[PDB]
Amino acid sequence: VFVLSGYEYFLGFLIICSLVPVLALAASALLRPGAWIQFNVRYYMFALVFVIFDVETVFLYPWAVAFHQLGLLAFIEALIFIAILVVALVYAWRKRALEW
Amino acid sequence: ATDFNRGIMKFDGADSPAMIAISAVLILGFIAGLIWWALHTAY
Amino acid sequence: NAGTILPETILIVTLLVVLLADLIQGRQADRWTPYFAIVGLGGAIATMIPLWTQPATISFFGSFISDHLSLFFRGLIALSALGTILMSIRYVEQTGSSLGEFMTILLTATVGGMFIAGAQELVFIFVALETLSIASYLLTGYTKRDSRSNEAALKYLLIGAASSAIFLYGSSLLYGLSGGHTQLPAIAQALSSESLGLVVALVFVIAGISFKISAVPFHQWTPDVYEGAPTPVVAFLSVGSKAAGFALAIRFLTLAFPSVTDQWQLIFTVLAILSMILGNVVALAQTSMKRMLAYSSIGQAGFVMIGFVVGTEAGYASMLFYLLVYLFMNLGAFTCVILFSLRTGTDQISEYAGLYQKDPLLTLGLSLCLLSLGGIPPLAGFFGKIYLFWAGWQAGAYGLVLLGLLTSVISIYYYIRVVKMMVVKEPQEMSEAVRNYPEVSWSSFGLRPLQVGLVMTVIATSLAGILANPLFNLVNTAVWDVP
Amino acid sequence: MQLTYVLILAALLFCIGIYGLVTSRNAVRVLMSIELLLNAVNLNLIGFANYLDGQQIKGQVFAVFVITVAAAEAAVGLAIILAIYRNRDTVDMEKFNLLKW
Amino acid sequence: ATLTQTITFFALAAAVIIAALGVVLLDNVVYSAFLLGGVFLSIAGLYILMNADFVSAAQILIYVGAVNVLILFAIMLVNKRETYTPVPGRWLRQGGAAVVSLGVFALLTKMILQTPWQLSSVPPTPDSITTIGQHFFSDFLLPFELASVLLLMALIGAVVLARRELVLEPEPILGEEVVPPLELPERPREP
Amino acid sequence: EVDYNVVDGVVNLTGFVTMVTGEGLKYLQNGRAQFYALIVLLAVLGFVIFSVQ
């Protein structure tokens, strides 16, 4: 059984937009004729605070959809989740994690 | 057996490892021979 | 219904105050932020005593129980961090790392461990096991420039993140062997047929349950982490992260599998007869002091599993009384490992020799905590082992207590080896501290918490067997709420 | 597509990450094989939630929290890789065996 | 109608295990990390067929967009131009790991097939974004608040384990005996 | 000499086959944490055959 409605066109549109580069690069294929990066830990540290906050935002998407269907108790509980991770943002500023 | 062979009446001359095992089977056999005597001769 | 998690949410608040003070004050807060976490741990201990009289409710929609068993193990993990903070007030303050940043990761492992003891959902077991495990990889590699703590943070990661995936595949199977039902009381009502699917779900979860308690086919991280990690973290994972794996195993293997019970009582005997042998014979061939206590924690784990496999009301009371006095033996021995590692470098055996005339409070603390770890009278670890063999003899198990006694004499020989090189060596036989001991002060930063964590632990090691009768009644009330 | 073909796919993905856990010599490929294990227990879980008790999806909530922990197990895990690399200038799992016995 | 949901399953079920063989068996480590997203995107395509449209988009946001980017940032930081090619280092211990991996698979395929699964014939996913947010605050509420403390700790610890020691690297603060900065006081020695 | 060597040899052999036992399982750990993950995964395969019958 598959009770999701709207995904009948998602399979073909996944194939058609995949057929946009693989055929245009083929339609072009018939018409055409001291090496160091310095180890600076800022690419990893900027991605480190991304993973902590991409998990933050994905926990807020079910709360934001069902927000007026939960009540005031589930709003204080969702506020403890944010206010703990607000200190996570304050920790990233003061410890010069995202200074670049 | 070098410290057992001090300069007094000891060091008889039979301190070889061939004599250690043949003195063991007579001494430990007499205790076991008296133990097996004991469970039958007493009552 | 959020009044049952009050011992954990007081530790949540003081986790944030010692974090913001590192950001606000900036290493000037390290003079007071350990002592705020002590009364934060003490205020979390003192609120478990009003919760002891409550009639064991199941709060948070059936996902958290507040029984006496969950409150006993919550106090053991809170006392494990209370003893660790009294140690690491000088230890990681001498490495130059931040003191407030250490005790934040140390308190997340505490509240992560304290939530394991009362969890009843498959998800809250895994979430609280994660934040205990994720916090402990950061603590074994907290010094970050050693090539020994970095090597110990790696081996604990690639086994810890591995064994928590074996634990998840058995936890996900418990969601699928039942028709949903992530809660452990709802699991037992659905599955009782003892099929092969329940067997693989049982083996997969005790690859991670018996990974925190370090049984021998899953113990391989323990002797390599415990010599690379900072010694207070070594002191924490031996009574805090080890009792939390024992807090899980009573709450998991008796609630999720009361039908299948002769199988995990057969596996954990193999986990006991292997960790009593390999915990105590390989600790003979150890030279490092933190490595001798590493195989000790594997060996003392097999004594706790003696009461776990018998499955009686005195058997589960024997493993909770032994884990209670185990905190007074590790945290008193590891205090003297730290207090010897702070005066002189290179804390290993055959460098403690020639002592007892220069540091007599260290040798009286280290001997009476290592002799009690061997289980000699009239110390606390003697009575703790007596109750394990009394409950072991009570229901079968005549070969476990014989192996528990024969490996307790092999346990004596390497513990008395440290007491040999503390008090019986002449003053012409010391290698370190040969007129090199720093003439102890108890006036520098953090040495007075290090001393009171030694005095109040050996007192709790010498007198906890003579005065065991209040502790025997405090433990036996935490067993009636165990199926 | 039945329930059985999802769990075999999750069990096969488990043993590929199991093989990558023991045979990989770079320390980052071991962490990439850990993510194969933590997606094996998620592919096992949503299939357990789509076919068993799909009205109140308790597996998809539990499948969310595994994604969050593995996000935090890799961020902690790669800070361990960068901590060894600053001291021991390689990433080679046959070179970290100095705490042997 | 029904076969178009099945032929897109095995096209994705083969896309994950080929990419999972690419992250394990390939000699290049950067090729493993780009194929690691091929594992994660194919599993995210498998969740849409399994009526998990939220967790499908929650995998592309984290496993593809956050974890795989974090992996790739932490592989372009470790190249060193040194593989050293020591394939037979100690022995043929890569054959003992092929025994257990085929053994666990032979275990679980025996377990998956013979187990009677009690699958329910009820209609699933009644707008499954509200029933997952009602679950974050009724049943799975205490896991939800502990995930913030887990993430906050994972931001505290992974910063202090990966930040550059540029504040005071030659810092002998005190001493009873000599201890190096940012290192454990138990100094290594041979017995 | 049957005291010092024979019945004292048994006592100094209980303490000798235990010291060389701990120096044989000391080599069970050898670093290389892939091998530590091997024993974890082999004992999973052991306990699922040992406990089904």
Instruction: Round to the nearest angstrom and report the end-to-end CA distance of chain A.
Output: 51
Tokens of A100: 């670049």
Phi, psi of C208 (to 5 degrees): -115, -30
C-beta pairs of F18-27 under 8 Å, 24+ apart in sequence: F18/C281, F18/C284, F18/C410, F19/C284, F19/C285, F21/C281, F22/C281, F22/C282, F22/C283, F22/C284, F22/C285, F23/C285, F25/C278, F25/C281, F25/C282, F26/C282, F26/C285, F26/D101, F27/D101
Q: How far is CA C469 from CA A75, C57, C258, C408, C477, in A?
A: 48, 27, 31, 24, 13
Number of CB atoms found within 10 A of residue D47's CB? 29
User: Helix crossing, E3-25 with D27-51: angle to 10°?
Assistant: 160
Interface residue D65 vs chain C (CB under 8 A): yes
Q: What gap in Å lies between CA C174 and CA C255, rounded to an integer?
A: 12
CA angle C205, C208, C213 (to 5 degrees): 125
Amino acid at C259: S
Q: Would you say C98 and C25 are in contact if contact means Cβ atoms under 8 Å apart?
A: no
Amino acid at E191: P
Task: Give Cβ neighbours of residue C226 (< 8 Å, ≥ 6 apart).
Answer: C234, C237, C238, C290, C291, C293, C294, C297
CB spacing of D74 vs A48 below 8 angstroms: no
| CATH architecture of the domain with residue range E2-161 | Up-down Bundle (1.20)
CB spacing of C16 vs A91 below 8 angstroms: no
| Best D15, D99, D100 residue to mutate vs chain C (most C CBs within 10 Å) | D99
Residues written for chain A: 100
Q: What gap in Å lies between CA C38 and CA C78, rounded to an integer?
A: 10
Closest by CA position to C329, among listed C467, C471, C454, C414 = C454
Q: What gap in Å lies between CA C133 and CA D34, rounded to an integer?
A: 15
* Unique residue bearing structure tokens 């005071």: E168
Q: Would you say D66 and E52 are in contact if contact means Cβ atoms under 8 Å apart?
A: no
Q: Would you say C25 and C91 are in contact if contact means Cβ atoms under 8 Å apart?
A: no
CB spacing of F36 vs C283 below 8 angstroms: no
Tokens of C317: 């009371």
Q: Residue A2 falls within a domain, yes or no?
A: no
Tokens of E83: 């593989």
What is the H or E stretch that residue C367 is in?
helix C360-374
CB spacing of D100 vs F30 below 8 angstroms: yes
C-beta pairs of C316-319 under 8 Å, 24+ apart in sequence: C316/C250, C316/C479, C316/C482, C317/C387, C317/C391, C317/C472, C317/C475, C317/C476, C317/C478, C317/C479, C318/C387, C318/C388, C318/C390, C318/C391, C318/C392, C319/C246, C319/C388
Interface residue F11 vs chain E (CB under 8 A): no
Q: What gap in Å lies between CA C149 and CA C145, rounded to an integer?
A: 7
**Residues on chain E touching A70 (C-beta within 8 angstroms):** 133-134, 137
What is the H or E stretch that residue C64 is in?
strand C64-65
Q: What is the 3-state secondary structure (H, E, C) of D38-82?
A: HHHHHHHHHHHHHHCCCCCCCHHHHHHHHHHHHHHHHHHHHHHHH
Q: What gap in Å lies between CA D41 and CA C204, rounded to an integer?
A: 12
Phi, psi of E105 (to 5 degrees): -70, -40
* Unique residue bearing structure tokens 């513990």: C415
Residues written for chain C: 483
Q: How far is CA E109 from CA D8, E99, E112, in A?
A: 6, 15, 5
SS3 assignment, position C121: strand
| Best F32, F36, F48 residue to mutate vs chain D (most D CBs within 10 Å) | F32
When divided into structural domains, chain A yields a total of: 1
Tokens of C175: 């969601």
Amino acid at A28: S
HSE, side-chain direction, 13 A CA sphere, residue C380: 27
List b or e across C219-250, with b for residues whose CB sees 16 or more CB atoms inside 10 angstroms: bbbbbbbbbbbbbbbbbbbbbbbbbbbbbbbb
Closest by CA position to E108, among listed D47, F44, D2 = F44
User: Helix crossing, C33-45 with C447-462: angle to 10°?
Assistant: 30
SS3 assignment, position F19: helix
**Chain D contacts to A (CB-CB under 8 A):** 64, 67-68, 71-72, 74-75, 78-79, 82
Q: What is the DSSP letter of C231?
A: H
Q: What gap in Å lies between CA D69 and CA D79, rounded to an integer?
A: 15
List b or e across E152-187, with b for residues whose CB sees 16 or more CB atoms inside 10 angstroms: bbbbbbbbbbbbeeeeeeeeeeeebbebbbbbbbbb
Q: Would you say C149 and C141 are in contact if contact means Cβ atoms under 8 Å apart?
A: yes
Q: What gap in Å lies between CA D48 and CA E133, rounded to an integer?
A: 20
Computed from CA positions of residues C155, C161, C163, C166, in that sequence, does the dihedral angle turn out positive or negative? negative
CB spacing of D56 vs C180 below 8 angstroms: yes
Q: Min CA distance, D66 vs chain F (Å)?
A: 21
CB spacing of F34 vs D96 below 8 angstroms: no
Q: Min CA distance, F25 vs chain D (Å)?
A: 9
Instruction: Round to the nearest angstrom and report the end-to-end CA distance of chain B.
Output: 43
SS3 assignment, position C65: strand
C-beta pairs of A31-39 under 8 Å, 24+ apart in sequence: A37/E76, A37/E79, A39/E77
The burial class, CB within 10 Å (0-12 / 13-18 / 19+), for C79 is buried
Amino acid at E141: L
Q: Would you say E21 and D27 are in contact if contact means Cβ atoms under 8 Å apart?
A: no
Q: What is the DSSP letter of C459?
A: H
Tokens of D1: 């597509």
**Residues on chain E touching A39 (C-beta within 8 angstroms):** 77
> How many distinct helices (H) and strands (E) make up chain C?
20, 2
Task: Give Cβ neighbours of residue B14 (< 8 Å, ≥ 6 apart).
Answer: none
Q: How far is CA D61 from CA C202, D54, D67, E131, E133, in A?
A: 23, 12, 10, 9, 9
Q: What gap in Å lies between CA F11 and CA E68, rounded to an integer?
A: 61
CB spacing of E142 vs C124 below 8 angstroms: yes
Q: What is the DSSP letter of C59?
A: E
When divided into structural domains, chain C yields a total of: 1
Number of CB atoms found within 10 A of residue B27's CB? 13
Q: What gap in Å lies between CA C98 and CA C29, rounded to an integer?
A: 10
DSSP per residue over C137-203, as a string?
HHHHTSS-SSSSHHHHHHHHHHHHHHHHHHHHHHHHHHHHHTTS--BHHHHHTT--S--HHHHHHHH
Structural domain including A28 reads 7-94
Q: Would you say C263 and F51 are in contact if contact means Cβ atoms under 8 Å apart?
A: yes
Q: What gap in Å lies between CA E69 and CA E64, rounded to an integer?
A: 7
Q: What gap in Å lies between CA E28 and CA E83, rounded to an integer?
A: 10
Phi, psi of C58 (to 5 degrees): -115, 95
Q: Which residues are paired to C64 by β-bridges?
A: C59, C119
Torsion of CA E57, E63, E66, E72, to 10 degrees: -140
Closest by CA position to C122, among listed C73, C171, C163, C59 = C171
Torsion of CA C99, C102, C104, C105, to 10 degrees: 180
Q: What gap in Å lies between CA C115 and CA C254, rounded to an integer?
A: 18
Q: How far is CA E122 from CA D1, D55, D56, in A?
A: 17, 7, 11
Computed from CA positions of residues C20, C23, C25, C28, in that sequence, does the dihedral angle turn out positive or negative? positive
CATH of domain D1-101: 1.10.287.3510
What is the H or E stretch that residue C58 is in?
strand C58-59
Residues written for chain E: 191
The burial class, CB within 10 Å (0-12 / 13-18 / 19+), for C391 is buried
Phi, psi of C64 (to 5 degrees): -150, 130
Q: What gap in Å lies between CA C378 and CA D15, rounded to an integer?
A: 52
Closest by CA position to C475, among listed C313, C248, C309 = C313
Q: What is the DSSP letter of E172?
A: -
Task: Give Cβ neighbours of residue E92 (< 8 Å, ≥ 6 apart).
Answer: none
Q: How far is CA C233 from CA C87, C109, E184, F16, in A?
A: 10, 11, 11, 35
The burial class, CB within 10 Å (0-12 / 13-18 / 19+), for C25 is middle
Residue boundaries of the structural domains of chain D: 1-101
List b or e across D62-101, with b for residues whose CB sees 16 or more CB atoms inside 10 angstroms: bbbbbbbbbbbbbbbbbbbbbbbbbebebbbbebbbebeb
Closest by CA position to E152, among listed F21, B17, A56, C64 = A56
Q: What gap in Å lies between CA C288 and CA C35, rounded to an integer?
A: 31
Instruction: Round to the nearest angstrom and report the end-to-end CA distance of chain C.
Output: 24
Q: What is the DSSP letter of C411?
A: H
In this structure, are strands C64-65 and C58-59 parallel, antiparallel, or unpaired?
antiparallel
DSSP per residue over A9-52, as a string?
HHHHHHHHHHHHHHHHHHHSTTT---------TTHHHHHHHHHH
SS3 assignment, position C256: coil
Q: Would you say C398 and E136 are in contact if contact means Cβ atoms under 8 Å apart?
A: no
Instruction: Round to the nearest angstrom and report the end-to-end CA distance of chain E.
Output: 74
Nearest CA in chain B to F5: B20
Q: What gap in Å lies between CA C167 and CA C204, rounded to an integer?
A: 6
Q: Which residues are paired to C260 by β-bridges?
A: none
Q: What gap in Å lies between CA F10 and CA E9, rounded to an integer?
A: 69
Q: What is the DSSP letter of C312?
A: S
Nearest CA in chain F to C283: F22
**Residues on chain A touching D60 (C-beta within 8 angstroms):** none
Q: What gap in Å lies between CA C106 and CA C58, rounded to an integer?
A: 27
